[PDB]
Amino acid sequence: IVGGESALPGAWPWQVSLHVQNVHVCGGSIITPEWIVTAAHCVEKPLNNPWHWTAFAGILRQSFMFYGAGYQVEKVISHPNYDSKTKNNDIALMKLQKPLTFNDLVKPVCLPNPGMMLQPEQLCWISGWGATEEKGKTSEVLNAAKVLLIETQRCNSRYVYDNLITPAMICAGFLQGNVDSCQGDSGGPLVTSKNNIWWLIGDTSWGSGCAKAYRPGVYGNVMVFTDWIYRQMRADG
Amino acid sequence: NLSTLLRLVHVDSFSCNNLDKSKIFGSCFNSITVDKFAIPNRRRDDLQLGSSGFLQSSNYKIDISSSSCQLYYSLPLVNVTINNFNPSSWNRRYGFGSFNLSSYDVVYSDHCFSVNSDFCPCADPSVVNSCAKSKPPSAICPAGTKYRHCDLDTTLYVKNWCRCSCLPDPISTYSPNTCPQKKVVVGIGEHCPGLGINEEKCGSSCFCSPDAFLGWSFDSCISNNRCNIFSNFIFNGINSGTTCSNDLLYSNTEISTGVCVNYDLYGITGQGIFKEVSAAYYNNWQ
What are the DSSP calls for A195-206, one per residue? TTEEEE---B--
In angstroms, the CA B186 to CA A96 distance is 66
Listed residue (B1, B12, B7) closest to B224, CA to CA: B12
The three-point CA angle B204-B207-B208 to 5° equals 150
List all residues 6 or more positions away from B87 whose beta carbon is below 8 Å from its beta carbon: B191, B192
Phi, psi angles (nearest 5°) of residue A234: -65, -25
Dihedral sign for Cα A173, A177, A178, A180, please. positive
Q: Could you say which of A127, A139, A181, A186 is catalytic?
A: A186
Contact: B157, A162; criterion CB under 8 Å:
no
Choose, out of B175, B199, B200, the residue to mutate when testing the contact with A (most A CBs < 10 Å): B175
Rounded CA separation A93/A77 (Å): 5
A-chain residues near B136 (CB < 8 A): none
Determine the longest span between alpha carbons in chain A, in angstroms. 49
Residues of chain A with Cβ-Cβ distance to B155 below 8 Å are: 161, 164, 208
Would you give the DSSP letter of residue B135? -
Nearest of B52, B60, B13 to residue B35 by alpha carbon? B60
Alpha carbons B170 and B57: distance in angstroms, whole number = 16
* Residue B107 identity (one-letter amino acid): V
Residues of B with CB under 8 A from a CB of A: 133-134, 153-157, 163, 165, 167-168, 174-178
| CB neighbours of residue A82 within 10 Å | 17
Q: Round to whole Å and give the CA distance between B4 and B11.
A: 11
Of B133, B154, B174, the CB nearest to A162: B133
CB A36 within 8 A of CB A93: yes
d(CA A155, CA A214): 9
Q: Rounded to an integer, what distance in angstroms lies between the CA atom of residue A38 and that of residue A204?
A: 9
Query: CB of A231 within 8 A of CB of A187?
Result: no
Q: Cα separation of A140 and A185, whole Å?
A: 13
| Dist CA B135 CA B128 (whole Å) | 7
Nearest 10 degrees: Cα torsion A192, A107, A53, A48:
-50
| Cβ contacts of A158 on chain B, cutoff 8 Å | 134
Locate the chain B residue with the closest alpha carbon to A161.
B155
Contact criterion met (CB below 8 Å) for A94 and A35: yes
User: Residue A159 and residue A138: Cα distance in Å, rounded?
Assistant: 31
Half-sphere exposure of B71 (CA within 13 A, CB side): 18
Q: Decide: A23 and A63 in contact? Cβ < 8 Å.
A: no
The minimal CB distance from A164 to the residues B155, B167, B176 is found for: B155
Closest CA to B39 of B190, B214, B232: B232
Chain A residues whose CB is inside 8 A of the B154 CB are 208
- Integer CA distances (angstroms), B182 to B20, B58, B190, B196, in order: 40, 13, 16, 9
Alpha-carbon gap, residue A184 to A82, rounded angstroms: 20
Backbone angles phi, psi at B231, to 5 degrees: -130, 150
E strands, chain B, where?
A: 10-17, 28-29, 31-38, 68-76, 105-109, 113-114, 150-152, 162-164, 182-183, 196-197, 213-214, 216-220, 222-223, 226-236, 243-244
Distance (Å, whole) CA B244 – CA B154:
73
Torsion sign over Cα B38, B62, B45, B194: positive
* Helices H / strands E in chain A, number of each: 2, 13
Pairwise CB contact (< 8 Å): B153 & A177:
no
Residues just before a chain gap in chain A (C–N exceeding 2.5 Å) are: none
Q: Are B223 and B207 in contact (CB under 8 A)?
A: no
What residues pair up with A200 in beta bridges, in sequence order? A191
Nearest one of B138, B119, B143 to B206, comparing CA atoms:
B138
Phi, psi of B156 (to 5 degrees): -125, -45
Tell me how far apart the alpha carbons of residues B280 and B286 are, in angstroms, rounded to a whole number.
11
Please tell me which residue of chain A has the smallest CA distance to B149: A213
Phi and psi at B36, nearest 5°, equal -155, 145
**Which chain A residues have a beta carbon less than 8 Å from that of B168?**
159
Residue of A nearest to B162 (CA): A159
User: Among positive and negative, which fits the CA dihedral B135, B137, B143, B145?
Assistant: negative
> What is the per-residue DSSP string for B94-114?
T--------TTEEEEES--EE
The dihedrals phi and psi of A33, each to the nearest 5 degrees, come to -80, 45
Residue B205 sits at φ, ψ, to 5 deg, of -75, 165
Number of helices and strands in chain B (H, E): 3, 15
| CA dist., res. A32 & res. A50, Å (int) | 20
DSSP A85: T
Out of A164, A175, A214, closest to residue B163 by CB: A214
CB B118 within 8 A of CB B145: yes
| Mutation to test the B interface, candidates A83, A171, A208, most B Cβ within 10 Å | A208
Cα B197 to Cα A160, B90, B117, B177: the distances in Å are 21, 11, 15, 16
Instruction: Determine the Cα–Cα distance for residues A180 and A1; give it in Å rounded to an integer.
Output: 6
Residue B216 CA to residue A50 CA, distance in Å, equals 64
Q: CB pairs under 8 A, 24+ apart, for B164-168? A: B164/B123, B164/B136, B164/B199, B165/A213, B165/B199, B166/B199, B167/A159, B167/A214, B168/A159, B168/B200
How many residues in chain A?
Answer: 237
- A104 is a catalytic site residue: no
Cα separation values, B107 from B36, B41, B81, Å:
15, 11, 13
H or E element that contains A153: helix A152-155
Q: Which is nearest to B120 in space by CA: B101, B156, B95?
A: B95
Neighbours of B41 (CB within 10 A): 13
Rounded distance between C-alpha atoms, residue B172 and residue B163, angstroms:
17
Which of A85, A206, A209 has its CB closest to that of B153? A209
**DSSP H or E segment with residue B127:** helix B125-128
Instruction: Quote the DSSP letter at residue B56.
Output: I
Method used experimentally: cryo-EM
Active-site annotation holder among A41, A139, A180, A185: A41
Torsions phi, psi of A155, nearest 5? -75, -20
Phi and psi torsions of A53, nearest 5°: -140, 140
Tell me what percent of chain B is helix, strand and coil, each rounded to the nearest 5. 10, 25, 65
Å from A208 to nearest chain B CA?
Answer: 5
Contacts of B134 in chain A (CB under 8 A): 158-159
Torsion angles phi and psi, residue B212, rounded to 5: -85, -5
Alpha carbon distances (Å) from B126 to A104, B108, B140, B259: 60, 39, 10, 97
Q: For residue A165, how many C-alpha atoms fall within 13 Å in the half-sphere facing its CB?
A: 25
- Separation between Cα atoms, residue A162 and residue B135, nearest integer Å: 14
Dist. CA A218–CA A220, nearest whole Å: 7
For residues B162 and A213, give the distance between their C-alpha atoms in angstroms, rounded to a whole number. Answer: 12
Contacts B165 to A, Cβ<8 Å: 213
Residue in B closest to A175 by C-alpha: B174
Across A98-233, the runs of DSSP E, i.e. the strands, are: 123-128, 143-150, 169-172, 191-194, 197-200, 217-220
A83 is catalytic: no
* A214–B174 CB contact, under 8 Å: yes
d(CA A185, CA A27): 7
Distance CA A17, CA B186 (A): 54
Cα–Cα dist B157/B154, whole Å: 7
Neighbours of B259 (CB within 10 A): 8
- A86, A159, A164 member nearest B163 (Cβ): A159
A24 is catalytic: no
Q: What is the dihedral of CA B131, B136, B139, B140, to 10 degrees?
A: -80
CB A215 within 8 A of CB A209: yes
Closest Cα to residue B91, out of B218, B198, B164, B219? B198
Strand partners, A144: A5, A127
Q: Of B243, B262, B226, B236, which is closest to residue B75 (Cα–Cα)?
A: B226
The closest of B191, B60, B203 to B114, measured between CA atoms, is: B191
